[PDB]
Amino acid sequence: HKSEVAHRFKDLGEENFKALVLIAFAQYLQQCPFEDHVKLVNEVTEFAKTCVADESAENCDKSLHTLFGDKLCTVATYGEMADCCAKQEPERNECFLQHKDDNPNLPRLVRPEVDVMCTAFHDNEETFLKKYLYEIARRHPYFYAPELLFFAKRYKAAFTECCQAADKAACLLPKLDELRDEGKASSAKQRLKCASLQKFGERAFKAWAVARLSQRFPKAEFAEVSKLVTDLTKVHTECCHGDLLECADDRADLAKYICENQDSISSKLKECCEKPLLEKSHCIAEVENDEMPADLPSLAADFVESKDVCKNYAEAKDVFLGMFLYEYARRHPDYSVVLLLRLAKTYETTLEKCCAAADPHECYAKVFDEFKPLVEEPQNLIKQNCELFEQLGEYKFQNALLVRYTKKVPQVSTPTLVEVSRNLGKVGSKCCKHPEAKRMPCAEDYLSVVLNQLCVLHEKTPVSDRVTKCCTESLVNRRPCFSALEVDETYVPCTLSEKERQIKKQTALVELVKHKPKATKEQLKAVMDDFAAFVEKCCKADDKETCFAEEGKKLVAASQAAL
C-alpha cells in the first residue's frame, strides 16, 4: 500500500497516468506554459515507475497532493497562486482549488487551417494530442478528466482518419466542430455536479443521484441504487477536488462493477459493457432509462397509509426519504430530477410537522395533494414554450426570452443572457421534438447547466444581490426563483456569417432592453424591424460603409426619439 503513485500507474496504465497528470497540472496551473508542464509530467511519470518496481523506495510513500503539489511548486511564485506554495499542506492543495480560474484570462483559441493542422499532427502526433489536453483543461478546470481522455481519443480519430481523406476539410471540420460543441456542454454539465457538492453539500448531490439512478434503473433494488450513489459520489468528490488519478480509477472500477452486476441494475447496458474502457463509462452515463417494473404497489400505502410511517421516519430519516426519492423517481421517468427532489423535500416537511402531532395520519393524509401544483407548474411550462417555439421559430423565440429576462435581470451581463437564451433555444429544438414523457428531464439538462453557468460567472463578476439570492437559496427551487424574479425596482439606467449575424442582432437588442426596460414589445419590434431595414438598405448601396455610418446614426435618435 505504501505508494499511491504506483497504485495509480499499475491501475490506469502509463498512457493514462501521463495524461490525467497533464490535465491536473493544467487545471491547477492554468496560466503556466505547455512545455513546462510536459517537463514535470515526465519527471513524475519516470518517478512513478521507480515506485512500481520498489514501493519502499525514497518518497514513494508520499501522498499525491504532497507529490503533485511539490512538482507544481517548482516555479509557480505565479501570482495569487504564488502564496499557494507557502501554505505547506493540506492548505497548499486547498489553495490551488479555490484559486481555479473558471473565467480565464487566457488568449482565445483560433482554429488554424486543415493542411496547417494536419502537419503539426502526423509529424508530431505526441505533443499534438498533448497540446489538446493542455488547452482544454486550462480553459475548463472542472472538465471531467476521465471524460477528457475519451475526448482526446475522439480527437485523435478525427485526425488519424481525416488527414488521409480525399476532402480533408469536409472530413475534419464537421467532427472537429462537433467535438468542440460536445466538450463545452460536458464542462458545464460537470461544473454543475461540482457546484452541487461545494455550494449545496454531499447530501443534495447524493439526493440528485438517488433520484436519477432510480429513474434510470427502476428494476434495480434500493440497496443497489444506494451502492452506485455511494461510488458515484466518491468519483465526483475526488474529480471535483482535483484527485484526477483516484476518480479516474474509481470510475473504471464502477463501469466494471455495473457490467458484472447488470442483472441487479439494467438490461440496457449490453453493448455499453462490450465497448473499450473510456467508451464504457461514457456509454453507461448517456444510457437510456430502463423500463419501470410491471405491476408495482402505490407509494401511498408505504408513505401515507402505513401506521409505521413516522416510526420508520424517526428511526432512519435519510434512509426513508431516500426510499421516498427512490420509489417516487422510479415510477416517474417523465419528471425532472429537480422536480422529484421538490416533492421529496415537500414530503420531508409534512413529516417533520405531522410526526410531532397527536394524529400524524389525519395531519399528513393530504400530502400527495401538495405535490400536484408542484408537478403541474413545469408540465405546463414545457407545453407552453414548445407551443411558442412551434409558433415563433428558434430565432424569434430566443428574442422573446432575451427581452423578457433582460427586463427581469439587467444586472446579469449581456453575453450571459445571449448564451442563456441560445441554450433554451435548444430546449425548443431538441426537447420539444420528443413526446411528452421524455421532454421535462430533457429540459432541466440545459436549464440546470445554463442557470448554474450564469450563477458561477456571477462569483467572478458579481452584480446583483437578487440573482445571488437564487444562486444560493436552493439547488432545486432555483428555476422558480429566476422565473419569479418579477424584476428589480427603480435602480436601472456586412455579412461573413448568418448564425452569428443573428447573435450580432441579439446582443444589440439585449443591450437595447438594458437601456430602456419600459419599451413595449411593439416599440422593441418596431426598432428591430427598422434595424433590419438599416442593414438591408446599406448591404445593397454602392457606397457600403457610407450608408452604415450616415443611415445608422439616423435611427439612433429615431429609437432614442421613440422614448
Known binding-site residues for Cu cation equal: 1
Least distance from C-beta 405 to ligand C7K, angstroms? 4
Q: Which is nearer to ligand C7K, 54 or 459 (CB)?
A: 459
Give yes or no for residue 209 binding ligand C7K (CB under 6 A).
yes
Residues in the chain: 563
Q: Of the candidates 205, 303, 313, 326, which one interacts with ligand C7K according to CB under 6 A?
A: 205
Give yes or no for residue 509 binding ligand C7K (CB under 6 A).
no
Give yes or no for residue 193 binding ligand C7K (CB under 6 A).
yes
Tell me the backbone φ, ψ of residue 354, rounded to 5 degrees.
-75, -25
Neighbours of 206 (CB within 10 A): 20
Give yes or no for residue 155 binding ligand C7K (CB under 6 A).
no
Q: Which is nearer to ligand C7K, 3 or 281 (CB)?
A: 281
Give yes or no for residue 327 binding ligand C7K (CB under 6 A).
no
Question: Which among 233, 210, 203, 196 has a CA at the least distance from the CA of 452?
Answer: 196
For the annotated binding site for (4Z,15Z)-bilirubin IXalpha, the residues are 234
Spatial separation of the C-alpha atoms in residues 48 and 483, rounded to whole Å = 52
- 88 sits in the region (left: phi over 0; alpha: psi -120 to 50; else beta) called left
Question: Which among 337, 318, 341, 345 has a CA at the least distance from the CA of 212?
Answer: 337
Give yes or no for residue 281 binding ligand C7K (CB under 6 A).
yes
Q: Which is nearer to ligand C7K, 226 or 336 (CB)?
A: 336
C-alpha cell at 367: 400530502
Is 17 within 8 Å of 45 (Cβ atoms)? yes
C-alpha cell at 113: 487551417
Least distance from C-beta 433 to ligand C7K, angstroms? 14
Neighbours of 159 (CB within 10 A): 22
Give yes or no for residue 514 binding ligand C7K (CB under 6 A).
no
Tell me the backbone φ, ψ of residue 307, rounded to 5 degrees.
-70, -30
Q: What is the DSSP string of 12-43?
A: H-HHHHHHHHHHHHHHHSSSS-HHHHHHHHHH
Q: Which is nearer to ligand C7K, 42 or 429 (CB)?
A: 429
Give yes or no for residue 513 binding ligand C7K (CB under 6 A).
no
Give yes or no for residue 187 binding ligand C7K (CB under 6 A).
no
SS3 percent helix, strand, coil of the chain, rounded to 5, is 70, 0, 30
Q: Of the candidates 12, 152, 192, 343, which one interacts with ligand C7K according to CB under 6 A?
A: 192
Question: Which among 303, 284, 293, 278 has a CA at the least distance from the CA of 354?
Answer: 303
* Residues contacting ligand C7K: total by CB under 6 A: 31
Give yes or no for residue 51 binding ligand C7K (CB under 6 A).
no
Q: Which amino acid is at 517?
A: P
Give yes or no for residue 447 binding ligand C7K (CB under 6 A).
yes
Binding mask 240-279 for ligand C7K (x = CB under 6 A): -----------x----------------------------
C-alpha cell at 450: 445554463
Q: Of the candidates 196, 266, 406, 506, which one interacts with ligand C7K according to CB under 6 A?
A: 196
Give yes or no for residue 519 binding ligand C7K (CB under 6 A).
no
Spatial separation of the C-alpha atoms in residues 309 and 460, rounded to whole Å = 46
Give yes or no for residue 524 binding ligand C7K (CB under 6 A).
no
Give yes or no for residue 483 binding ligand C7K (CB under 6 A).
yes
Q: Of the candidates 27, 30, 237, 385, which one interacts with ligand C7K according to CB under 6 A?
A: 385
- Exposed/middle/buried for residue 427 (C-beta within 10 Å: 0-12, 13-18, 19+): buried
Instruction: Write the CA distances from 106 to 30, 32, 34, 75, 101, integer angstroms.
Output: 8, 10, 13, 19, 10
Q: Of the candidates 208, 303, 326, 397, which one interacts with ligand C7K according to CB under 6 A?
A: 208
Question: Which among 23, 323, 430, 329 has a CA at the least distance from the CA of 190?
Answer: 23
Taking contact as CB under 6 A, which single stretch among the options 77-85, 479-487, 525-533, 549-557 is the one that binds ligand C7K?
479-487
Neighbours of 44 (CB within 10 A): 20
**Cell 444506494 belongs to residue:** 226
Q: Which is nearer to ligand C7K, 30 or 385 (CB)?
A: 385
Q: Which is nearer to ligand C7K, 5 or 338 (CB)?
A: 338
Give yes or no for residue 479 binding ligand C7K (CB under 6 A).
yes
Q: Which is nearer to ligand C7K, 198 or 312 (CB)?
A: 198
Taking contact as CB under 6 A, which single stretch among the options 160-168, 175-183, 439-447, 537-545 is the one that binds ligand C7K?
439-447
Least distance from C-beta 397 to ligand C7K, angstroms? 9
Q: Which amino acid is at 102?
A: D
For the annotated binding site, the residues are 1, 4, 11, 65, 234, 238, 241, 243, 246, 249, 253
Give yes or no for residue 338 binding ligand C7K (CB under 6 A).
yes
Q: Which amino acid is at 246?
A: E
C-alpha cell at 55: 514501493
Axis crossing angle, helix 371-408 with helix 500-515, rounded to the nearest 10:
90
Least distance from C-beta 561 to ligand C7K, angstroms? 30
Q: Which is nearer to ligand C7K, 233 or 559 (CB)?
A: 233
Give yes or no for residue 405 binding ligand C7K (CB under 6 A).
yes
Q: Of the candidates 186, 187, 336, 398, which one interacts with ligand C7K according to CB under 6 A?
A: 336
Terminal CA-CA length for the chain: 74
Least distance from C-beta 412 to ligand C7K, angstroms? 7
Interface residues with ligand C7K (CB under 6 A)? 192-193, 196, 205, 208-209, 212-213, 232, 251, 281, 284-285, 336, 338-339, 378, 381-382, 385, 401, 405, 420, 424, 427, 443-444, 447, 479, 482-483
